[PDB]
Request: fold
Amino acid sequence: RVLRGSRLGAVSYETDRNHDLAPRQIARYRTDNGEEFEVPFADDAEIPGTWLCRNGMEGTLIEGDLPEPKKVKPPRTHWDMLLERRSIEELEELLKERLELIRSRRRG
Amino acid sequence: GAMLDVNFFDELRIGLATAEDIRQWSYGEVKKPETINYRTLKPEKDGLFCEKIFGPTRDWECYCGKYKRVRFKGIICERCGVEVTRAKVRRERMGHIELAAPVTHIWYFKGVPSRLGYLLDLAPKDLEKIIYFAAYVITSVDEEMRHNELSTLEAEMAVERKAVEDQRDGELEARAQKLEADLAELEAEGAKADARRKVRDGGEREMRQIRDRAQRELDRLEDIWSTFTKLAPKQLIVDENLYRELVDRYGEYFTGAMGAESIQKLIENFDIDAEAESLRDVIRNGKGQKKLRALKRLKVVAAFQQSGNSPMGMVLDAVPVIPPELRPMVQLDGGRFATSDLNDLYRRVINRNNRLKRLIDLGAPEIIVNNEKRMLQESVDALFDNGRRGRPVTGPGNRPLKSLSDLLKGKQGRFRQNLLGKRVDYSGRSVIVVGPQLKLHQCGLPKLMALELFKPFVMKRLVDLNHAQNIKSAKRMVERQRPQVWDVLEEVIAEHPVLLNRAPTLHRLGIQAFEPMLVEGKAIQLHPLVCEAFNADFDGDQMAVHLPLSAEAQAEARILMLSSNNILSPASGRPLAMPRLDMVTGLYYLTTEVPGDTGEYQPASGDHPETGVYSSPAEAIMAADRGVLSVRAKIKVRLTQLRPPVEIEAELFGHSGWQPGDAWMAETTLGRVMFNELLPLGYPFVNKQMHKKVQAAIINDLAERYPMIVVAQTVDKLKDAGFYWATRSGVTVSMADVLVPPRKKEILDHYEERADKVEKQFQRGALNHDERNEALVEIWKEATDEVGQALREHYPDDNPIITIVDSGATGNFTQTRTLAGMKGLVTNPKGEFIPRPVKSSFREGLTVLEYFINTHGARKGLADTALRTADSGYLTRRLVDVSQDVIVREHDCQTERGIVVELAERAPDGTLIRDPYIETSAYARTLGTDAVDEAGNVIVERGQDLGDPEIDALLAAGITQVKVRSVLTCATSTGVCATCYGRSMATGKLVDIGEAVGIVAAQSIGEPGTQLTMTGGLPRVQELFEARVPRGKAPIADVTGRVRLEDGERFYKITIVPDDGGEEVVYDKISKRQRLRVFKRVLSDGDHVEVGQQLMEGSADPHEVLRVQGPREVQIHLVREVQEVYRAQGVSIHDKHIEVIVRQMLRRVTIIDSGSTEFLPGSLIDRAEFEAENRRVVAEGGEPAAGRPVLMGITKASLATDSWLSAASFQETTRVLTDAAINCRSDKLNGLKENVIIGKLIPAGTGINRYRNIAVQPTEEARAAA
Amino acid sequence: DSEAVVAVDAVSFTLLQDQLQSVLDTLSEREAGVVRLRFGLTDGQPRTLDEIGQVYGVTRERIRQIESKTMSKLRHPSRSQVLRDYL
DNA sequence: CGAACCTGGTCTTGACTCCATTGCCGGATTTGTATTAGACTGGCAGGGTTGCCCCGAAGCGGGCG
DNA sequence: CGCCCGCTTCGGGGCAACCCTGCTAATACAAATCCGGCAATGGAGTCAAGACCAGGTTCG
Ligand SMILES: [Mg+2]
Ligand SMILES: [Zn+2]
Ligand SMILES: [Zn+2]
Reply:
């Protein structure tokens, strides 16, 4: 009849030692729209330049050590869906067709 | 301002939240609709359980597992991105969602009234077309640009309009030419004429089509031009084709949007203060419904104006996220997961947000965009309050999903379920059994139950004794029960009080504190004298045991809730430890006097002496243990240890007949001598036959004269003697002792022939069905009383059945009559009487049909009892809802106003007969005025407790009217003062400065509703407190003069001639169901009536007698009216409880004229606040508002509360909470309701600051001596 | 809640720490410091043989010998009946 | 009282030995994305039920010109 | 003797709450992720002897 469950999280029991801790660093991260966030890192820790801040947008490191900006590609354009299946000469034929069309529409 | 909440609370300010504050609260943006992996069962990044955002689940262990120590704390590992900490910050930390599109909060749109609708002054049924993307709305316009361009613009409008004219000119010309061609092709040939006319008709209908097509185009152009000229903000373009063909022209002159961003823009280009002054001018100059609507708008407009709020926060941009432990996904055994039904709504919101965001980043056509925006809006609406608009979103099998607002509202709402109760540790329950040998301040207790209750205590004590190395082997020994642990359990239970409670808790004595003691068995032994307080018969009713822990808790249990300290009623001062069912019969047998008995005194002396006296009661005991003396025989003892009565005592010894030394004789029985041995030494001899009423008077006398601990011992000794002589009383029931009256049968013959004549006359048809039924009812009631009379005279007094009744232990005479004799009338299931009736007794045995008739009333009574106890619980709820904030805070308000009491009116001869309802009214009161005896001395000075002897002195002095204080005239602002409350009904002394008299009054009124056996009952009481219009609504007078009395066609047409020159007040709608009031004789046409004389019989509304004869008269009326019902059920309630309740009704006043200081007419404000602001405002703004005293109902008084948290749990919790946030009304935490909810030490009893801050030190002399 | 605080285990672990400190203080100062720095019982971090021989200015071997001797000294049922009851 | 001697440990030294700890490559599986060419172009539980309040409209009366 | 609006009342509609009632199928491919097995170790521990005497114990 009795039923139990478990929140999947460890419950450890030590004392809240306020005095003796691992010493730590503080790194200032800045987002795009002039927002400052200071993140407590450890001493023995490399400080990453890029960061997802408390703001939720991307926040960079306040010293300009220049992480790599994009190094990526655009996914696929509608131009790419067109160009992978058509000819540029064909598109030129359609363009000159529509140009002569707006010609015949506009001045006679 | 303290979010870590360290114990110095004073206020609780609710406020509307800005989106800036929302993103200030959050520790990250959730942006993926994920919960947890299916496979590794760890939470996902950017999800609804994201440990980067919400926090770690493992105490001081990060997600990537780089750091796993508590020494690593307050750092964030660069890989996992998690602040390593304790894993209960996931209870506190919130997340947020930055939206792509604005959203309106639903509580400002779909309530009553619409807050957005008043703030914008638009129709809600048109605002819904705005925010749900059904209508565009102009949010701004450049008026001066149109104003200086508009002549040129209407010139090009004429150019536009002239083009359609040229079009129809060309079309009508070409069509006229084509019809001329049709005429030339019809007239050049030979044919039938009608076909040519139809070709003509075709041409004409074509040019008809031309001309009205042109006309319609011109209509469209003039309409769109009229719209452009009359263009203004807050204008709605419904059906959107006008908008779509409109904007392309002149779009540089206006902005018109659709949906929530348009609402945002309208709030942005908005002054509150210009429209504030505009509404002030309108209420300055308006009239009627226009100014009423202006007031209703000015309410919320000045609400936004006065506070530091902003209506910008009414629309929403960032949606917060509740911490995930409040909505957890706990697994069960086997991976069956248990979500919390909010996660589905959050997933809908995240999915629709990301879909909208991808649509915007792609570039999408308009319909899909507005569709996704409306879906997002409805998703946030379902997130906040599912089912508020349209159709509730359901899950599996069409069960609607619990929204976020559903946590607070309804049955399972957070406020009410917190207010309902909490299951507690250190408690237990069992079935109870009688404990008749035990002391009053005790309770027996099952040892295996107390072994579990007191387990940390016994573990500590057998750690102190060297029986275990630690607490762990101590706990194991407690499980293994090594028999020294019972001795240690005795030691720890010694002097440690426990609580006891029978559910339900009807009143204050439902919880009492007893000293436990370890008893064999497994049931809770209850002392028998508290069964009346608990209403606990031993038919299997269980009781719940609690246990105090702190020293303060042990003190409160030991001193307040102890058995010996709570003896009297809190309601009406009479005791509840009083002897009862068995021991009353025991003592009645023990003290009754029986002449014609063995060893009875005779004074007659032949050769013998009188041979009846006995020198000592010890000698009497010896001669009674030998079989000479019966106990109930009359003798003449010589007493040396008992106090003689006042006649004999004053006769012999004058100054003091002091029983420790004196010796005196009396003619009594042995039993009464042994009885007065139980009573204390100072008490005089009684020498009466102990009826229950006599014993009640005795115990009242003891409690009013002697200290309480004496009375507890006396009642215990009475219990022992009552049981010991209930044994020997010989009261048994044999069916040979249920004697029948012998001439019952001829009485049945008599009334049977009478009923036979009546029914035969009905069979003649001379009288109808109703009159013969009523005649049968009256004849059989006469026969019933005849049989009961014959039964009553037939029984001898030693018949045990009549002995129990005449003693007053239990049962009325009617139950004895229905045992032996005749049941009589059994009811209709409707409520009428069955005219048969039952002619037999239970000893005779009924018939099939008679028993079948009896079933109706039996089952109706059971169902009525269930309904009564439920509704009495509800009425007790409402009374606690009203009176929860009335405590004593001062000793004396020192007014001199106060009510008068009738107080033992005289005769027409002048003989002061005692008024029967003095004990409920005049006692336990303090005289605010003096009393003098025909300008003689002051008999009773100002402010005396008004108990029995001084009231007897007032009856001696012959005065009947005293101006006495009341809580109706207490002059304290915050509650009552003590002297106007008088004697506390249970202590017997003056009330303290911390008593919650409101809750005591509420329980004292609400308790006998079960005994209220029934419009003349509990709904009558309820509508009296709800102050509704009565069903027995009968008119009262307005001024003196004789009546214009008349009973016209089929109902009544009664008017009143005024004594002064005035109008006749016309009373039209009086049905013939009402009857003429009998008063002073029966009312007649031309009776000079009073001002408060009731015209008909019945019950007037109290509103009318308030409006005519003010507050004093309606108070005097309501007390008498409710007390009359409690008289009718034979339940004595002291009147000060009803005084407390009615005082809460008459707190607030209405406004009919505003004065000049922020007053709306018809507003209900407190009287004292009103009078104080008037005495401030008479200087510099001296327009006193015209206030009128108003009587508001108990629910209405509850809803007109002080704080939002004080209400919070009654009725439309949402509507309370929304304008609570709008007003930004801060709480001050002055009631006890809120301090209970937040768990603060409440300001009552032990809780106020006078007792909370007591400095404790020893006396310095004893400090030095020790 | 199977992952909730049993609340007798907390005070039992407290008493464990308390009498543990008592039994560790029954011995000499260097030995108790060795055991505390070895098992991290004074800070939470188990400092190894190099750190203990650093803080006492001695070899790893001497720390190993001292720790083995402390294990010999702890292994008395007289010393450890209360400790045996703790598990 | 001085030389002989076993044992308090105390600590060094080398020498060895086991073992995680990256690291690297190679393979396995696992998740995410794109792509399928005959035509095939607008549905549905809600449903009710009570009750109470609120506004709109109707009806009428009453004070005015 | 008519006018005009304001008061009053009925009536319907909307809203809060609550229960009843219902209650097509792959492929191609890349990219990521995992995991499996030697191979750099250097570090962390571990036998074993040996040298430091210092102080009680033995014989003279
Ligand atoms: Mg019972
Ligand atoms: Zn981590
Ligand atoms: Zn007072």
User: Anything to note?
Assistant: Residues 18 and 24 of chain A are 14 Å apart (CA to CA).
